Design a protein around this ligand. Sequence first.
Ligand SMILES: NC(=O)c1ccc[n+]([C@@H]2O[C@H](COP(=O)([O-])OP(=O)(O)OC[C@H]3O[C@@H](n4cnc5c(N)ncnc54)[C@H](OP(=O)(O)O)[C@@H]3O)[C@@H](O)[C@H]2O)c1
Ligand SMILES: NC(=O)c1ccc[n+]([C@@H]2O[C@H](COP(=O)([O-])OP(=O)(O)OC[C@H]3O[C@@H](n4cnc5c(N)ncnc54)[C@H](OP(=O)(O)O)[C@@H]3O)[C@@H](O)[C@H]2O)c1
Lengths: 319, 317
Amino acid sequence: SIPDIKLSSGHLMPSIGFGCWKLANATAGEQVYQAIKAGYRLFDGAEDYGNEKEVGDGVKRAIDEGLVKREEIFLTSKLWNNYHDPKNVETALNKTLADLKVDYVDLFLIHFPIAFKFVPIEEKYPPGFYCGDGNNFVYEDVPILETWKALEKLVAAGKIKSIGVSNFPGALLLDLLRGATIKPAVLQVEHHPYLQQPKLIEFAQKAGVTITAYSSFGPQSFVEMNQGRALNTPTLFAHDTIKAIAAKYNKTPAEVLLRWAAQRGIAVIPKSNLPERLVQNRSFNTFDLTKEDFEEIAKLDIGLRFNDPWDWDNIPIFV
Amino acid sequence: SIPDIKLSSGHLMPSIGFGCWKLANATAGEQVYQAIKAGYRLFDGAEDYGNEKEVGDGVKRAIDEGLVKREEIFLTSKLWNNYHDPKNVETALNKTLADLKVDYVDLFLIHFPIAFKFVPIEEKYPPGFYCGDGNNFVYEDVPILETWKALEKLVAAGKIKSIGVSNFPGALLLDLLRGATIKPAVLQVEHHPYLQQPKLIEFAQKAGVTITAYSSFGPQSFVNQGRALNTPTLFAHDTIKAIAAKYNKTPAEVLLRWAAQRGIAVIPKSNLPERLVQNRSFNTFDLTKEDFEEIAKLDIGLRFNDPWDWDNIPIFV
Ligand SMILES: NC(=O)c1ccc[n+]([C@@H]2O[C@H](COP(=O)([O-])OP(=O)(O)OC[C@H]3O[C@@H](n4cnc5c(N)ncnc54)[C@H](OP(=O)(O)O)[C@@H]3O)[C@@H](O)[C@H]2O)c1
Ligand SMILES: NC(=O)c1ccc[n+]([C@@H]2O[C@H](COP(=O)([O-])OP(=O)(O)OC[C@H]3O[C@@H](n4cnc5c(N)ncnc54)[C@H](OP(=O)(O)O)[C@@H]3O)[C@@H](O)[C@H]2O)c1
């Protein structure tokens, strides 16, 4: 049912996966397991999510029960900001591998083109915004390419199958493509009708980089974090454009939001604590948005970004 | 008169300069010379402008006539897109030096974070968008930092006083800063009330990078581009007029002052002598917080110089 996408690395990646951000440690293992039973095969995690051990527990349970074999699960993780210095990259990957209880991750991404000062794992993990000095942000002078070469070596050592990046704007991705020996296979970015960045999508896809969309439901994911920008934003779920299209096909607004990306070759990783939403978030490929529908949804693009490092410490990633 | 700005390199840079883009070759020498007599000391040029030889004649004439000495003139040039590969960087710079008839340039900027396939100087100069294969754009795998290191080397060789970048978005500048031994001293970007990019300015200034604004008059500079032609003029914008008529200054003087008062260098260019004068003496009034607030409302992120138009190059996306 779930179409696979061919990555530039020579490996297949499910076009629909299960998001793990803000999956409570207490119920994550069980929800990952239920997701596998519901047919999900790709799991989008990260060291920063702090629940990789639980994600691993869920996968290991499914494997121990004979529902799936390791090779049938696509595990994505992300290298956090404090670990860009080459000498720390493998250490961070090792922690991820140990927590996930596996020998390799299918996809490992540079979480952000941001290098926080290294913080020893036994000092605090996941470190979040901690940089070794109270609440102050401290950075390291590690160019992206240095981190990328450390990742390329880990691919050669068999610990990572495919490598890619997240939160990279066009000029940065373009430059990485110039110095990379193993081209980044995936660009994972915030993508929803309020932030469509059509030119980025076009450039990346023309360059052979697969797009994975995150926060496909826009502000939704951020309101529980009490983010003001998101709370002030009208939901996509109650938006007249999305609702009119959903009604026309007799689909849910969530299905239209996910299909709007899937139909354009963009991979999705919807997240949900609700069992009822598992099947739904993975079975939306039952109708086709017309040229007209796309023109209508295109009108909602306003460049509204919910995940912006500028908010953390005026980091100029998207400026 | 014209305030100087101390660059992160230690060297000083006039805050008001004379732009050389489109200065016709037949009269560029004379215009640069007249500009020097008019008080200008910084000349913003580029290999791509194709008139460095003539800009050089102008400066050489002012020096031979004893109006100025080489070290009182600040020359800026820019490394064009076909010369990013380190093995070609010095070739391009040597051509700029031979053309300007100088032993070094004061500021050498990476013109665009774009690497076109190398085309020999002898094959075509300036190459412009020609990449050695008909009208097709062809690129080279040369990371920004490799080009930068070649420039740092040319600084140690004494051929360049300060180095910097142009048309670099925030993320790219941030990354270059992590790898630079000599920090880029300047960030030259399009900057006007319709494209204010305040967060980029704030980040750059805070990192110690000096901003040089170009196209200070917005749409007035690309007018045969449709985008610019179909954009309401800033010279007739109600907010600009209001502030200009409120200080008895021209709209042009308000547009330049808005940048200058914020520590941003400007490089206006006028074929007309009167304006030539106007453009170097607009620091005769201050904008109030309220003025800035009203001007800041014009920001719509409208960009006239976008590589996306050339070949869907993702520099600003
Ligand atoms: N690399 C990065 O920077 C980055 C940043 C953010 C996210 N990501 C990744 O991408 C994933 C997805 O993004 P996200 O978690 O931010 O947000 P999302 O998937 O857009 O989140 C959807 C929000 O909508 C609700 N929801 C889920 N299915 C729904 C449905 N069918 N109908 C109505 N509401 C529904 C969920 O609530 P319930 O849980 O109560 O169902 C959740 O609060 C993450 O889990 C993570 O793996 C990566
Ligand atoms: N790095 C880059 O990518 C880049 C890109 C573009 C430009 N630049 C540099 O920055 C400079 C700025 O570009 P530009 O020359 O097109 O922009 P500009 O100097 O802002 O152009 C102003 C236009 O307005 C007119 N003008 C000048 N002064 C005036 C005044 N006081 N009152 C009314 N009209 C006035 C001029 O025509 P008249 O001559 O008839 O008065 C000129 O056509 C260039 O020369 C170049 O050195 C760099």
